[PDB]
Design a protein around this ligand. Structure first.
Ligand SMILES: *[C@@H]1O[C@H](CO)[C@@H](O[C@@H]2O[C@H](CO)[C@@H](O[C@@H]3O[C@H](CO)[C@@H](O)[C@H](O)[C@@H]3O)[C@H](O)[C@H]2NC(C)=O)[C@H](O)[C@H]1NC(C)=O
Ligand SMILES: *[C@@H]1O[C@H](CO)[C@@H](O[C@@H]2O[C@H](CO)[C@@H](O)[C@H](O)[C@H]2NC(C)=O)[C@H](O)[C@H]1NC(C)=O
Ligand SMILES: *[C@@H]1O[C@H](CO)[C@@H](O[C@@H]2O[C@H](CO)[C@@H](O)[C@H](O)[C@H]2NC(C)=O)[C@H](O)[C@H]1NC(C)=O
Ligand SMILES: *[C@@H]1O[C@H](CO)[C@@H](O[C@@H]2O[C@H](CO)[C@@H](O)[C@H](O)[C@H]2NC(C)=O)[C@H](O)[C@H]1NC(C)=O
Ligand SMILES: Cn1c(=O)c2c(nc(N3CC[NH2+]CC3)n2Cc2ccccc2)n(C)c1=O
Ligand SMILES: Cn1c(=O)c2c(nc(N3CC[NH2+]CC3)n2Cc2ccccc2)n(C)c1=O
Ligand SMILES: Cn1c(=O)c2c(nc(N3CC[NH2+]CC3)n2Cc2ccccc2)n(C)c1=O
Ligand SMILES: Cn1c(=O)c2c(nc(N3CC[NH2+]CC3)n2Cc2ccccc2)n(C)c1=O
Ligand SMILES: *[C@@H]1O[C@H](CO)[C@@H](O)[C@H](O)[C@H]1NC(C)=O
Ligand SMILES: *[C@@H]1O[C@H](CO)[C@@H](O)[C@H](O)[C@H]1NC(C)=O
Ligand SMILES: *[C@@H]1O[C@H](CO)[C@@H](O)[C@H](O)[C@H]1NC(C)=O
Ligand SMILES: *[C@@H]1O[C@H](CO)[C@@H](O)[C@H](O)[C@H]1NC(C)=O
Ligand SMILES: *[C@@H]1O[C@H](CO)[C@@H](O)[C@H](O)[C@H]1NC(C)=O
Ligand SMILES: *[C@@H]1O[C@H](CO)[C@@H](O)[C@H](O)[C@H]1NC(C)=O
Ligand SMILES: *[C@@H]1O[C@H](CO)[C@@H](O)[C@H](O)[C@H]1NC(C)=O
Ligand SMILES: *[C@@H]1O[C@H](CO)[C@@H](O)[C@H](O)[C@H]1NC(C)=O
Lengths: 728, 728
């Protein structure tokens, strides 16, 4: 008999899952890193030529973290000195190389500690942020022109997001957007003057005698939020002895009236820009299409060019409103919005008309719009086979919504049921990325007749390797809760014995619009637990989960910690009846919202779970950030939703932990879910005379992802579970 | 059958040990709190009368935390609104109550948040500290006179100590001293301007949305230290419109030359004061006796009145240089110093001459000088039976040092071997306090006849309750390590069967001048471990331990973490050979320095210990305070002792932890041994791939003493030990 997938196999990634990352640079060509050099492929034929010899990297005096070729191909940025900040943010040093002269620009260099940098969409202009201010370099070798003067550490950010905007609104650090042709440079200014500071200790290397205190303007629920300003700069007049020509665009009056967020920016044409704003409440957003007035430099908005989007049952969009996809000429756009029935579908809008027309419909949802031509619209949805945890690429005819074809559905039906796509510049070619249920598969296709063209990466090596290991099997199925069909997944140990009662581990996320059940292939900790430790690992998507319509997703609106926690319990009760499950050994674990749900479940007193592990959990919503929290909970005031904020804390269920074995884990430098959350929960448990276990991870943040900490937590969690399940 | 002493019995103090706290107020009277009344006792004839009826307390309107009667018995101070700060410091509100007119002073009340307050030694003058400044009230009903104007939060302290002086030098918050007749008020001023701040999070009550950051000027080893100034205020001129008459006394040149500490103050007569100073190196201290010059108001210092004390093998004194005890006239004094053999004994000094004469001698040590009269000196020593862990009261005739009597040695030889004493004014009577090995016994005696007069408290009630429980016995004995005899104690389970093999827990402190082996009776966690769980708990005092001469104590000078750690290992190795120890089940635990030694031992790779628990340990000397650390280690510089600071960290031993089960515990609000110490240690263990267990305690300080935390830590450690010993 073979061997099993071990914890070390997981921790050291002994079984490599290959991928194929390419960067389109034209309607038919893409850059790809092979053996350290940047190759240039011609999708059409498959022939490649060298674009940058690995040799050039060696001659640089540092490790190249990332590269970015200019749109006209005359220059390339070299990113080094990478220093991570939050989830997307970081600082770095940059060198600009001249691909013509095949030399390295040395005059007027990009500054040290640059916060963000980007080429214009055409040519080779540059805009970057340094010390919270924006700078523009029209030519690599020329000196930069300062765009903003208000930048102030921890107070005013120009061109980059503050903490909450990076994490909860844009999911990006960048807040700069060049116009299609480089005339205009739009940017947002964030003002955190009145945002309270979260403070926590950072111990750093053993050599530091006194700990450092980290301070971050971070708006917790109901607190003062950062304010925002959007401007469009006319770069044509940037001159050393000239002022900066910029125009401030404000949101329509229906949002300007109170606290709001800027949630999206889309350039339509050189003279048309679409701004998307949302009220602080987040159930009311509006798109404002503004046109440039050549005679005054103003950006004008009109009531006819404005489009509202609200939600009466919940919040708008999944984590933010979906983005508008404009036609080439900008006279109309396609965007995903909720149906009359609550399902997210593509609607066609006239830029200056309010009524829109849905072009897709059904008891399923469009995930996103991937590409748009004059003739077609390509999108991703979970329509196929009615499985919401599946994803496929579809193409619909614009002049006939009856003609919709599925480009990926039948390519490899057993191996591939979960895809994402990447199209070349005018959608003439697309790369399909299959993430499971079988081994990932990357392939290239021509939009003309949808020919397979060629395989880019098929993971044959991993496949050869895995046939010698006793892998667990993954099965998806459905169970009915309160008249609704909900999906679950179970990772089952190899050589499954129906007569044996296996211990069961429930892995949970369960946050609003979460999806823990899908057909994605993963080599994870659960793979190990099932393969070597014979533990069945299962996940369930109940009320509050996404991609199945707003009736399901919005079910937990204003009441986080109720129906989603309850469904995890009821679903587990059903699993516990299966003959091959040892109902006396059921555990539950989760990270983040999953840690919160795990804790609420253990504190429910259901008698269904023997033990559980919460990693970096929210323990009280008033401790989490304003943007995410308020979106689902409203404000913690008696006039709004205070009662539901107060009875949804983990601390309120403290007494009930006397019935279970609990492991609470948290990184001390978590800037996201503050260590404070676990500190407050451990204290209430201690105050209740409840015994449990904890594990802090010094200086680790929300991902507890440094190499050693990562190995350590999974090793520590595996020992705790084995002890809970009486496993040798 | 019988009950055993349980964890709950320990945690809830079911078996109460009683004591008898009294306050001498004259040569033959003392106050005592009984049934909440303040009683006035007459030692002569044993009769008693009510000094303050408890009715008074009931009429107050707040919980009276404590009280202090004025020396002339006309007023009484009531302390309420007590709020603890560090180990000795706290703030409170105070009412003054007139005993004659049995009414409460309501005019010119003492301010709230007062930091320290004390009556003058005679009369009823008051001196108090508020907002870091000193104030004097000549009468309870009169407005106070401000004495200092430099008070400043976290910077300048007048009349009270800063953090390090409080914890390591004075072992008190108070820094003011009235002269015997109340003429002068001396006080020290501490300047923390250049002391770095230790910063850490305090989460507070669950309702606090954002954690607060605590900041304390705290000097770590080798860092900038607080500076001090000493003044004597002539209180006779205090008047609403008069300036403050004061004189600054500076240390002698030999100490003034560099960083130093004021370590003690002793009023000799109304016109003579003794200041004791020590160099930052702490192997050099000097006593400077200053005389008041009536014609100029200054306090004059002279070389003939200066006395130097140094140490060539280590530091001066035990934790500070011993204090001088002056005769009534102030022409000579008695003080404990190390003799030529390295044993601490009483030397008689002439105030204006440098040579002294020893009045005690032998291979044992004087612990302290308790009282002094024109004809006798009373002291406590461990001479009896040659056991360093025993304590007795002796009286030596001043005109004939060969004449010494032991006053407590034979009162109750079996029950009482560890005494402390408290003498009335002029040493006419003394209360004797017996702490073990039997149950505590408090007695009152007459000094003229040395008759026992009466038993104040004999704990006969506790004795009765304990006859019904299976109590463990405590045995003290000796072993030889490298040719030197050292003491150890073992708490043995009831019905100790010399033939069975019991698990063994080593409880360690082992810091410089520590004494974990004594004849004190204690109802502890260990009592429960022996009585209920049948675990032998042992302690051992090896190299570095105190009360056995400098050769033993100074053995670890400049090398903490070496010999005392090795001695714990070798002694246990010998214990494991005694026959009744299950060598497969030996553990070690300790708090503070003991937590440090516990960790160094586990990291030694001796294979002797299966597991250990360290509570709030030091992990690296450079992280601990300057006063304590430098005393034994010198400076962490390559010029001085850096090499020994560097290889004495627990982290340097991380790799050896892979062989043991370890539990690391620390309170997050520990202001003494910063959480940073365990946080840096766990980070090193994670980095080395070591699995271990952790337990933080939210908002708990160095004592992890809140009621619920106390129960929680011991319950958690019991579970861990029992699991390590395979005990159900
Ligand atoms: C205020 O003072 C009066 C005394 O003047 C207090 O009354 C005394 O209270 C104590 C404590 O309850 C009584 O003692 C008890 O005696 C029996 C022995 O027979 C013993 O079993 C108990 O353990 C305890 O020792 C004492 O007899 C009683 N004395 C008088 C004169 O009544 C009163 O309690 C005080 N007020 C408060 C509320 O503290
Ligand atoms: C950032 O926002 C703050 C408001 O919180 C602005 O501060 C105000 O500025 C005006 C004009 O300078 C003053 O009259 C107010 O007293 C300020 N209020 C506060 C709270 O300071 C600040 O000007 C904004 N900064 C930018 C660049 O827009
Ligand atoms: C907070 O309180 C609400 C209202 O009492 C709880 O909602 C109820 O939950 C029970 C389930 O035990 C249902 O049977 C009721 O119908 C619910 N009432 C409402 C108004 O919907 C809610 O569960 C509590 N939240 C938490 C996290 O405990
Ligand atoms: C730090 O290093 C010193 C020097 O090597 C250690 O002291 C030696 O310890 C060995 C083994 O116990 C003895 O045999 C040597 O005689 C010691 N040398 C000296 C000069 O003392 C010391 O133990 C180390 N400190 C720690 C905590 O490991
Ligand atoms: C838009 N805009 C600007 O352009 C601008 C500016 N501040 C400056 N300078 C700051 C110090 N040097 C001189 C002024 N300029 C540049 C400028 C202004 C007017 C004429 C020429 C150049 N601010 C604060 C601004 O908001
Ligand atoms: C398991 N889990 C989560 O829970 C989760 C999550 N992403 C989010 N949010 C969207 C991105 N930014 C804010 C958080 N959460 C929800 C959450 C995280 C932490 C605290 C509270 C809620 N992901 C990607 C995830 O895998
Ligand atoms: C010793 N001494 C003092 O006495 C003193 C003082 N500061 C004051 N006052 C502060 C505000 N009111 C007036 C001055 N006084 C009191 C005082 C000085 C001179 C005559 C009368 C009263 N300082 C700083 C000082 O060191
Ligand atoms: C067990 N243990 C200790 O260890 C200890 C101690 N007292 C001290 N020092 C003297 C008084 N105040 C400062 C510390 N330490 C030694 C120590 C404590 C914390 C860190 C490093 C050394 N006590 C009374 C004690 O019982
Ligand atoms: C550069 O490319 C060559 C093939 O063109 C390859 O053999 C070589 O390994 C590469 N250099 C490296 C190791 O970066
Ligand atoms: C591919 O080959 C064709 C010739 O058929 C050539 O024109 C084209 O430039 C090549 N592209 C690359 C990048 O190799
Ligand atoms: C801009 O101003 C600077 C002032 O030093 C001057 O040297 C430069 O020539 C000016 N630019 C022009 C040509 O207008
Ligand atoms: C939007 O949310 C707010 C909660 O702050 C609520 O009061 C308001 O009625 C909501 N509007 C809609 C359309 O439901
Ligand atoms: C004790 O009795 C003596 C006389 O016998 C008396 O002077 C004294 O005041 C009494 N003490 C008390 C406090 O009762
Ligand atoms: C405190 O010390 C600083 C130097 O560290 C000095 O500047 C300051 O004046 C001192 N303050 C007092 C009141 O002694
Ligand atoms: C002190 O001076 C004040 C006025 O400044 C006056 O009212 C008061 O009477 C004076 N007190 C004395 C003791 O002279
Ligand atoms: C006191 O310590 C210093 C510095 O560590 C040392 O140089 C000196 O020799 C010591 N003094 C004596 C008398 O040992």
């Amino acid at each position: 008999s073979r061997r099993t997938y071990t914890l070390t196999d997981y921790l050291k990634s002994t079984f490599r899952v290959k991928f194929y990352t390419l960067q389109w640079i034209s309607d038919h060509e893409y850059l790809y890193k092979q053996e350290n050099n940047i190759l240039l492929f011609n999708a059409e034929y498959g022939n490649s030529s060298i674009f940058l010899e690995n040799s050039t990297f060696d001659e640089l005096g540092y490790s190249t973290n990332d590269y970015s070729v200019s749109p006209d191909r005359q220059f390339i940025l070299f990113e080094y000195n990478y220093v991570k900040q939050w989830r997307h943010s970081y600082t770095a040093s940059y060198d600009i190389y001249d691909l013509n002269k095949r030399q390295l620009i040395t005059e007027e260099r990009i500054p040290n500690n640059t916060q963000w940098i980007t080429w214009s969409p055409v040519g080779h202009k540059l805009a970057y942020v340094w010390n919270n201010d924006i700078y523009v370099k029209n030519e690599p070798n020329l000196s930069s022109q300062r765009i903003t003067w208000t930048g102030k550490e921890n107070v005013i950010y120009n061109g980059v997001t503050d903490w909450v905007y990076e994490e909860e609104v844009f999911s990006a650090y960048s807040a700069l957007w060049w116009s299609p042709n480089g005339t205009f440079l739009a940017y947002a200014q964030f003002n955190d003057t009145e945002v309270p500071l979260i403070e926590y200790s950072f111990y750093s290397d053993e050599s530091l005698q006194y700990p450092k205190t980290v301070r971050i303007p971070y708006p917790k629920a109901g607190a003062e939020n950062p304010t925002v300003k959007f401007f469009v700069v006319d770069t044509r007049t940037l001159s050393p002895n000239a002022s900066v020509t910029s125009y401030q665009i404000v949101p329509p009056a229906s949002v300007l009236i109170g606290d709001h967020y800027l949630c999206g920016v889309t350039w339509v044409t050189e003279e048309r820009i679409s701004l998307q704003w949302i009220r602080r409440a987040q159930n009311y957003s509006i798109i404002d299409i503004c046109d440039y007035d050549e005679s005054t430099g103003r950006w004008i908005s009109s009531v006819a060019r404005q489009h509202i989007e609200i939600s009466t049952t919940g919040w708008v969009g999944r984590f933010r409103p979906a983005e508008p996809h404009f036609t080439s000429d900008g006279n109309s756009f396609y965007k995903i919005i909720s149906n009359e029935e609550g399902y997210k579908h593509i609607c066609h809008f006239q830029t200056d008309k309010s009524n829109c027309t849905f072009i897709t419909k059904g008891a399923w949802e469009v995930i996103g719009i991937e590409a748009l031509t004059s003739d077609y619209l390509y999108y991703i949805s979970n329509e196929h086979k009615g499985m919401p945890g599946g994803r496929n690429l579809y193409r619909i005819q614009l002049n006939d919504y009856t003609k919709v074809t599925c480009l990926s559905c039948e390519l490899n039906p057993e191996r591939c049921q979960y895809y994402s796509a990447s199209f070349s510049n005018k959608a003439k070619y697309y790369q399909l990325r299959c993430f499971g249920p079988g081994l990932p598969l990357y392939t290239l296709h021509s939009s003309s007749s949808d020919k397979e063209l060629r395989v880019l990466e098929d993971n044959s090596a991993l496949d050869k390797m895995l046939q010698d290991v006793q892998m667990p099997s993954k099965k998806l199925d459905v169970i009915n809760l309160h008249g609704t069909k909900f999906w679950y997944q179970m990772i089952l140990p190899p050589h499954f014995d129906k007569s044996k009662k296996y211990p069961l581990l429930i892995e949970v996320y369960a946050g609003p619009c979460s999806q823990k059940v899908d057909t994605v292939f993963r080599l994870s900790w659960a793979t190990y637990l099932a393969s070597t430790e014979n533990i069945i690992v299962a996940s369930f998507d109940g009320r509050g989960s996404g991609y199945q319509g707003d009736k399901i997703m919005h079910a937990i609106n204003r009441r986080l910690g109720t129906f989603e926690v309850e469904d995890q319990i009821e679903a587990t009760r059903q699993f516990s009846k299966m003959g091959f499950v040892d109902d006396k050994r059921i555990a539950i674990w989760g990270w983040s919202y999953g840690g919160y749900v795990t804790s609420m479940v253990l504190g429910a007193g259901s008698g269904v779970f023997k033990c559980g592990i919460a990693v970096a959990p929210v323990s009280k919503w008033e401790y989490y950030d304003s943007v995410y929290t308020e979106r689902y909970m409203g404000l913690p005031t008696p006039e709004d939703n205070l009662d539901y904020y107060r009875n949804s804390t983990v601390m309120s269920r403290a007494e009930n932990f006397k019935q279970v074995e609990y492991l609470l884990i948290h990184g001390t430098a978590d800037d996201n879910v503050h260590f404070q959350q676990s500190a407050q929960l451990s204290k209430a448990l201690v105050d209740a005379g409840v015994d449990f276990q904890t594990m802090w991870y010094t200086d680790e943040d929300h991902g507890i992802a440094s190499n050693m900490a990562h190995q350590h937590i999974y090793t520590h969690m595996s020992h705790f579970l084995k002890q809970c399940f009486s496993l040798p």
